[PDB]
Amino acid sequence: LDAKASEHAARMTAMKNATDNANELIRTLTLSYNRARQAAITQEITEIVAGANAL
Amino acid sequence: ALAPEIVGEEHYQVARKVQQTLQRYKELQDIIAILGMDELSDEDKLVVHRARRIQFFLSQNFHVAEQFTGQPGSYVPVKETVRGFKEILEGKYDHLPEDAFRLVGRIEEVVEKAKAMGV
Amino acid sequence: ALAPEIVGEEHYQVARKVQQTLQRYKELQDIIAILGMDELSDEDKLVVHRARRIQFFLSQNFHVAEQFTGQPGSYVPVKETVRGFKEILEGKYDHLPEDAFRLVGRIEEVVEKAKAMGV
Amino acid sequence: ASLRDIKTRINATKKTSQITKAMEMVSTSKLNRAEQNAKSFVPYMEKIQEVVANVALGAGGASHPMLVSRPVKKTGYLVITSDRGLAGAYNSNVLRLVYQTIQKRHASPDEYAIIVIGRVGLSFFRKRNMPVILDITRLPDQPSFADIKEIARKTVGLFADGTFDELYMYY
Amino acid sequence: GKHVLVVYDDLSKQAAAYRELSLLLRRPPGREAYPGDIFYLHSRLLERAAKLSDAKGGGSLTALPFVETQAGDISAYIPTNVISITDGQIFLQSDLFFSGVRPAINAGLSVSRVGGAAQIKAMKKVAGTLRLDLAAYRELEAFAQFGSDLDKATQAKLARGARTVEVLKQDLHQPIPVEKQVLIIYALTRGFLDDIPVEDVRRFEKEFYLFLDQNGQHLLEHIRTTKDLPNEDDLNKAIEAFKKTFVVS
Amino acid sequence: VAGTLRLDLAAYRELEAFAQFGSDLDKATQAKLARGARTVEVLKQDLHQPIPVEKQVLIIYALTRGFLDDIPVEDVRRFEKEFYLFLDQNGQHLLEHIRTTKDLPNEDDLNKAIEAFKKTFVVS
């Protein structure tokens, strides 16, 4: 009985770290996603401006 | 030039096996980071064990790199590279540490360096 | 137009119940995949048992699907589909194999298909 | 890489996060269930202990100080492990101590033997070459008395022969 | 009245050349500096492939345009333009290429609207089941990361999916007749392969092709003439005889 | 009055994510879950039917003082409607007092009125 309850406690306390690590990875990847997409949008703006000026 | 009829069946199989192992190790990174190293199956643990050693073995010491660090560098024939990678894939050197495979030439230098480190 | 005063109280109740059962099933899929289905609460076993049949019954055979199937289509009035889904929700057909509900029209045709399969 | 590749990783990570959350909740529910029995079983153990401690001022076949009574062979230890994974080091440490004690110490590979509880224990002892006698593949998580009873009677009975005199649990 | 197959090696190179010419001619640029008529150019080119009616001689022309993407960006201008025009697409991926699955067709993404009508009866009979098997395997593939500790039902589907993936693998410059493809896919889908280990499936397939060449030519000619599967018991008996002769590693 | 409502809803929104399990501890889980569910039920509203601020005050006070503990979660909306009818019938003093002074009425009188309503309410 002690071993079974210890098993349940161990799984519970492992899932906390699992979820926290997953959410940390989510945070890092989302930040990278946005900081990359901003470069694409400013490149689009630059291309539009340059094309307008070229005429 | 990486075709079976050009380099040979053994070379082709070794190259494809190395690439497959490295791709699998690259894929396993997310689960390794999240769930930890201990939750992977006994297969993927061996996959990581082989992949780290292969990745470190791909490094080499160069002749012109002597002006940076004092290591003299070496020239390795294709037969020796293929033999060493086949030996690693068979699991012969699973017991040696990771750092033994860094910046060496032929596979025998890995054993020599492990002996020098104490193994 | 999915409003109580437009389609009717019974129709609204049936639609809301179907959506809620499907949403409940959506949250149990990973748990049922990982652990054996027995760990589900006994109500949730009925919920899954009915969600599968609702998902299968939402499918329909078309008159234009003749060119792809070789099988004639069907036309189901809303007055009949509300009754069919009410009966499935209340459980008057939990004793049929789930495959009898696929690609079929009225609820009576489900029983016909089940008996053709040998129920 | 690109956004097209980053979004797939984000989606997979979110799905894994949801799975971990659900399994944490299930683990908490089973923890409460186990803790129920962890206090419910107390009166029976107290009843047995109070009487055996009462009548424990004499010598009997095995419950006397059993000093050097059949050390000859097969020293038997019990190992309690789970079947499901995701527990972290819970099963690993129990396997580690059993190994590093008995497999390290005992010279002849058969002067010891182990009976296991749990899938992972027997899996590790099939990895190894240990003399495992019998086990239980998958006990129900419920307290399982009058179910574990036959296993327990078998354990004490194969003791009664003296097959595993030095019985000593790891858990 | 003849039948023609046409392959355009890189429509992205063609579009880049047209963009260069347009920019040198000083026409206003659209998105990604491409001219506004780039979609009209590609649609006008591709829509000349057709299946003529019987009064027109019955001829046909089928096209296989190629488009190259950088870092899997399928939402770029030319990729979307070509995707919206064609009847279907086939997606090849480097991650599948290196993991051993070559050719690297991604079944989940690839589409073919003409599908079904473009297959023979016997091939359809087995492709119908293969589609569902692959779909279920890909849906459950995510949970393999949690180790072998899974439910009893799911492991059979994982094994079936693994064997299916092994069967679909193919080597270089070895086209396979459809009368052999249908037989091997039938052998996979009917459970005859569910005892061969995943590691020996390719050798099983090669030995099965050789065994079919040596014996069972009646099945091959029946398929090649009637475009339909033979009698069920005869095919099962032939596969059973091969399984009795075959040696595992 | 709104402070207790805000706190209760904020506390309940954390336990909404705990939809798998219920009574772990009565203080930590069951009571908060039930009160938050009743809060969500009273905060629902029908289309194109605004209600006066005094009646909002009375219903929110009723919820936040625990007078709705006995009433089941499913019947709360009918409770609220019948309470508004009972107010329009027999609470002119309370309504005028709040409408004139912008403050809560005498707590004992308001408790007596809500008790009188609760006697006549029938749960089904």
Q: How far apart are CA E162 and CA E185, in angstroms?
A: 14
Residue with tokens 């003409």: E114
Three-state DSSP class for residue E53 = coil
Tokens of E226: 């009637």
Tokens of F68: 């709705």
Q: With contact defined as beta carbons under 8 Å apart, do E185 and E167 qualify?
A: yes
DSSP secondary-structure letter at F89? H
Output the CATH code of domain D21-171.
3.40.1380.10
Query: Which residues are paired to E60 by β-bridges?
Result: E3, E51
Chains C and E touch (3+ CB pairs under 8 A): yes
Q: In chain C, which residue's Cα lies nearest the Cα of E158?
A: C33
Residue of C26, C39, C40 to mutate, interface with D, max D Cβ within 10 Å:
C39
Tokens of A44: 């689009």
Measured over the CA atoms of residue B39, residue B44, residue B46 and residue B48, the dihedral's sign is: negative
Q: How far apart are CA C59 and CA E205, in angstroms?
A: 37
Catalytically active residues of E are 113
Distances (CA, A) of C19 to C33, C51, C54, D13, E62: 22, 10, 10, 27, 45
Chains D and B touch (3+ CB pairs under 8 A): yes
E100 backbone φψ class: left, alpha, beta (φ>0; ψ -120 to 50): left
Q: Round to the nearest angstrom and report the end-to-end CA distance of chain B.
A: 39
- Subunits with 3+ C-beta pairs closer than 8 A to F: D
Residue C49 belongs to some domain of the structure: yes
Cβ contact (<8 Å) for C31 and D26? yes
Q: With contact defined as beta carbons under 8 Å apart, do C94 and C84 qualify?
A: no
Contacts of B39 in chain D (CB under 8 A): 85-86, 88
Residue C98 belongs to some domain of the structure: yes
Q: How far is C33 from chain E (nearest CA, A)?
A: 7
Residue E93 counted as an annotated binding residue: no
Q: With contact defined as beta carbons under 8 Å apart, do C50 and C90 qualify?
A: no
Residue type at E72 in one-letter notation: G
C34: nearest CB among E116, E150, E152:
E150
Residue B75 belongs to some domain of the structure: yes
Residue B3 belongs to some domain of the structure: no
Output the CA torsion B72→B73→B74→B78 (10° steps): 180
Residue with tokens 């849906």: E139
D86 has a chain E CB within 8 A of its CB: yes
Q: How far apart are CA C105 and CA C8, in angstroms?
A: 23
Burial class (CB in 10 A: 0-12, 13-18, 19+), E77: middle
Residue of A8, A28, A32 to mutate, interface with D, max D Cβ within 10 Å:
A8
Number of domains in chain B: 1
Residue B20 belongs to some domain of the structure: yes
Contacts of D16 in chain B (CB under 8 A): 30-31, 34
Nearby residues of D169 by Cβ (< 8 Å), 6 or more positions away? D77, D78, D79, D80
Tokens of C62: 């078309």
Q: CB atoms < 10 A from the CB of C9, how many? A: 9
Q: How far apart are CA F72 and CA F122, in angstroms?
A: 11
Query: Which residues are paired to D169 by β-bridges?
Result: D78
Sort strands E111-112 and E88-89 into parallel, antiparallel or unpaired.
antiparallel
Q: Round to the nearest angstrom and report the end-to-end CA distance of chain A.
A: 82
Residue B2 belongs to some domain of the structure: no
Q: How far is C57 from chain D (nearest CA, A)?
A: 28
F25 backbone φψ class: left, alpha, beta (φ>0; ψ -120 to 50): beta
- Subunits with 3+ C-beta pairs closer than 8 A to D: A, B, C, E, F
Cβ contact (<8 Å) for E151 and C68? no
Nearby residues of E113 by Cβ (< 8 Å), 6 or more positions away? E87, E88
H helices of C1-119, in order, are 4-7, 9-34, 42-58, 66-69, 78-90, 107-116
Kindly report the backbone phi and psi dihedral angles of residue E60, in degrees, each rounded to the nearest multiple of 5, phi listed first.
-160, 160
Q: How far apart are CA F38 and CA F75, in angstroms?
A: 10
Query: How is chain D split into domains, by residue range?
Result: 21-171
Q: How far apart are CA F123 and CA F68, in angstroms?
A: 12
What resolution in angstrom units was achieved for this structure?
A: 3.4
Distances (CA, A) of F63 to A16, B22, B81, F83: 35, 62, 79, 12
Contacts of E147 in chain B (CB under 8 A): 39-41
Residue C1 belongs to some domain of the structure: no
Query: Which residues are paired to D80 by β-bridges?
Result: D117
Residue type at B82 in one-letter notation: V
Structural domain that includes position B47: 9-117
Tokens of C111: 């029983």
Tokens of D157: 């009975």
Three-state DSSP class for residue B117 = helix
Residue C18 belongs to some domain of the structure: yes
Sort strands D75-80 and D168-170 into parallel, antiparallel or unpaired.
parallel
Kindly report the backbone phi and psi dihedral angles of residue E3, in degrees, each rounded to the nearest multiple of 5, phi listed first.
-115, 135
Nearby residues of D4 by Cβ (< 8 Å), 6 or more positions away? E71, E72, E73, E74, E75
Q: With contact defined as beta carbons under 8 Å apart, do F99 and F70 qualify?
A: no
> What is the CATH classification number for the domain harbouring B90?
1.10.1140.10
Q: How far apart are CA D128 and CA D104, in angstroms?
A: 13
Q: How far apart are CA E224 and CA D69, in angstroms?
A: 80
Output the CA torsion E77→E79→E84→E89 (10° steps): -170
| Cis? peptide before E175, omega within 30° of 0 | no
Q: How far apart are CA E79 and CA A43, in angstroms?
A: 20
Distances (CA, A) of C97 to B86, C45, C50, C52, E142: 53, 15, 11, 10, 28
Q: With contact defined as beta carbons under 8 Å apart, do F79 and F68 qualify?
A: yes
Q: With contact defined as beta carbons under 8 Å apart, do D24 and A36 qualify?
A: no
